[PDB]
């Protein structure tokens, strides 16, 4: 069966065409700079990278160009458009309604719009992708997979903020969490690698990239996650501040004559790794490189970054009353043996020991266990594949 | 030697007169409603509680009334005012300058004012108490003991927020932490009870009262604390929101047409326990009582409250790479066997087991160990005595 996996953000649509049976990526790419000048499609078919220049005023005309070139028999991969058996969409916010992936009909579509104000910068462009896909591929089923859904199992004690309850009643302000379908993917994948059922494992998953969150996955259900009502909460991120003292923003606004918009922006665009390094970079490996070159200041940014991750592992261990395994994934989790090592140094009191050899080996996309045989808590690097996860939910639903 | 211990807040001075040698409270009390109508002094000498009605326009005239009645030979306790050998003051904020308690001279006094803008609601009234004490008791040494000082050992990785570093350079925005001299008192007291040197213990101290913070006390030095730049960060408090998603305030302000002042207030006066219980109470035992009576909603507030404490213990355990002991103290920590039990249920993965009998016994001011003999992490209830701690620093400094 052939699933087309779509992820439409405000400026772009990026796609993979997966063959379920072989679970093989037939091709992938990105339609970039939609709405802006010099929009284009970057299309990869194995080794080859093809660049197509063209005006793409919106997501529909963009998805058209994608579909056309899936079939164009020079840069193509399938004979017909009938070859696409189903389409799977990443939708950022599902709210409290959507507990798991769903087949999209009018009902679902209306229900997604209703949730859209809870992620105004993301959901609109997801829907744009869905509506465009249903239009250009009539009859082909679409499945929505929600970034927030994996986290819907989180108990009340964990998703209510210590703020007037009216704010939840009235605006549904709670912890929703994000990177759901990634935490779900790697937690499940880790259990398979350990040769054990997911329902008898307490796993802490660390999705650490340009954006980062941790998830506490107790017996297969998520019990807590680092991100909150929005993606600002929790770990240090590329440009996001993570956790801070509720009072700071108010102080900064007042001492500097800054509207809440101007401050929210600063917390969101100019903070985190970028903020800490005085505007050096937001890319964590730019700092890793500079720290290894002897730059004193980066060694600190690195330590700050790692420290907070370590504390979250500790915190969530407490939340589940145990850890059986810890999983690193995403851009940094998969590629920084140093970060993995620093974070784990805080954790030997739990019985965590790394195998230096294995740690340095599992880099650039490889996957495996990094804890020593004797280590009481298992540590794994499981490169995330959120797209495949979508394709798999689409596959299951569509078979019916 | 006789130390007069003072704690001057904006509206009141509260005092204890301690006899170092016996470490006996000769008398204590409070001068209330200074500046407001019907100001008064409540004065306790053992069993007796004496109420004196009088206008007290400011802290000086208030301290005068205190000093007078320390000597009045009906409600008094000392023959002369010469009997007071030293005076110890609680000063909320010490900033980065003051690492430990200091003998007050002009230099110190000026240096405290310089730090005052970092706690505008507290420091001013502390100084008022110092200046009044130096005036009315010329020649008698005054010692300042700083709520932030114990926390000055916290490393950089732990006190810098993931915000533009400029904000620290320019305004000294970092984690300072509070309840310093309480975390210091109980961590030290716990080590004594265990018959072990403080420098070979990893202690997590939980000051849980109307304000609440946790401290990570690694080998006698504090390495992290829950409160931040201000007392808003961390645990759920009586009326304070504790930790929340940086973004929430901005959302609430914008959806409701509320100035940052109006929002900061809501987070500070109407949130936490009060906020969660829809305005029922901010006193945690009011909720404990109602939860035990079968009220479903309070059981939840209780669970939320406890949960976050438990997570902090877990987090800080990770920070120190171990826990040797956990200490409960302050209003709730000392008096809620239920909270202590709930919090510890999350911690058996660390080897924490409570003795139900001992837990329920150590109530209303008693102190002792609550972990079972076999428990791998020791748990103690150590009623806090911040005043005695001040008297002891005053004693040491003054002997010289």
Swiss-Prot record, chains A, B:
User: Which processes are annotated in GO (biological process)?
Assistant: acetate metabolic process; acetyl-CoA biosynthetic process
Question: Which cofactors does it use?
Answer: Mg(2+); Mn(2+)
Record's keyword terms, sorted: ATP-binding, Cytoplasm, Kinase, Magnesium, Metal-binding, Nucleotide-binding, Transferase
Q: Which CDD domains match?
A: ASKHA_NBD_AcK_PK
Give me the Gene Ontology terms describing cellular component.
cytoplasm
Superkingdom, natural source: Bacteria
Enzyme class name: transferase
Coarse class of the primary localization is cytoplasm
Task: Please name the catalytic residues of this protein.
Answer: 147
Q: Where is this site: Transition state stabilizer?
A: 179, 240
Pfam families in UniProt: Acetate_kinase (PF00871)
Q: Kindly list the places in or outside the cell where this protein is found, as annotated in its UniProt entry.
A: Cytoplasm
Task: Report the co-factor binding details.
Answer: Mg(2+). Can also accept Mn(2+).
Role, per record: Catalyzes the formation of acetyl phosphate from acetate and ATP. Can also catalyze the reverse reaction. Phosphorylates propionate (54%) in addition to acetate (100%). Uses GTP (100%), ITP (163%), UTP (56%), and CTP (21%) as phosphoryl donors in addition to ATP (100%).
What family does the entry list? Belongs to the acetokinase family.
What protein does this entry describe? Answer: Acetate kinase
Q: Which organism is it from?
A: Thermotoga maritima (strain ATCC 43589 / DSM 3109 / JCM 10099 / NBRC 100826 / MSB8)
């Amino acid at each position: 069966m052939r699933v087309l996996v779509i992820n439409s953000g405000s400026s772009s649509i990026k796609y993979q065409l997966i063959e379920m049976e072989g679970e093989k990526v037939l091709c992938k790419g990105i339609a970039e700079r939609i709405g802006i000048e010099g929009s284009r499609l970057v299309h990869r078919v194995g080794d080859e990278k093809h660049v197509i220049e063209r005006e793409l005023p919106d997501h529909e005309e963009a998805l058209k160009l994608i579909l056309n070139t899936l079939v164009d028999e020079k840069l193509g991969v399938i004979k017909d458009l009938k070859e696409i058996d189903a389409v799977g969409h990443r939708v950022v916010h599902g709210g409290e309604r959507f507990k798991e992936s769903v087949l999209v009909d009018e009902e679902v579509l209306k229900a997604i719009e209703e949730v859209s104000p809870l992620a105004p910068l993301h959901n609109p462009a997801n829907l744009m992708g869905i509506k465009a896909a249903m239009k250009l591929l009539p009859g082909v089923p679409n499945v929505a997979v929600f970034d927030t859904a994996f986290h819907q199992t989180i108990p009340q004690k964990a998703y209510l903020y210590a703020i007037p309850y009216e704010y939840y009643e009235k605006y549904k302000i709670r912890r929703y969490g994000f990177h759901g379908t990634s935490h779900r993917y790697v937690s499940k994948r880790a259990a398979e690698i350990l040769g054990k059922k997911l329902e008898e494992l307490k796993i802490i998953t660390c999705h650490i990239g340009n954006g980062a969150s941790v998830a506490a996955v107790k017996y297969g259900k998520c019990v807590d996650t680092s991100m909150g009502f929005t993606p600002l909460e929790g770990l240090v991120m590329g440009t996001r501040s993570g956790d801070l003292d509720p009072a700071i923003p108010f102080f900064i606004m007042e001492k500097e004559g800054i509207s809440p918009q101007e401050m929210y922006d600063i917390l969101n665009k100019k903070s985190g790794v970028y903020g800490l390094s005085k505007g050096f970079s937001s890319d964590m490996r730019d700092i890793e490189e500079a720290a290894l070159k002897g730059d004193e200041w980066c060694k600190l940014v690195l330590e700050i970054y790692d420290y907070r991750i370590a504390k979250y592992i500790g915190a969530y261990a407490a939340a589940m009353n145990g850890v059986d395994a810890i999983v690193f994934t995403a851009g940094v989790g998969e590629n920084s043996p140093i970060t993995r090592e620093d974070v784990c140094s805080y954790l030997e009191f739990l019985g965590v020991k790394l195998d230096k050899q294995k740690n340095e080996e599992t880099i650039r996309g490889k996957e495996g266990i990094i804890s020593t045989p004797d280590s009481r808590v298992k540590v794994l690097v499981v490169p995330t594949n959120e797209e495949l996860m979508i394709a798999r939910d689409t596959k299951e639903i569509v078979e019916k």
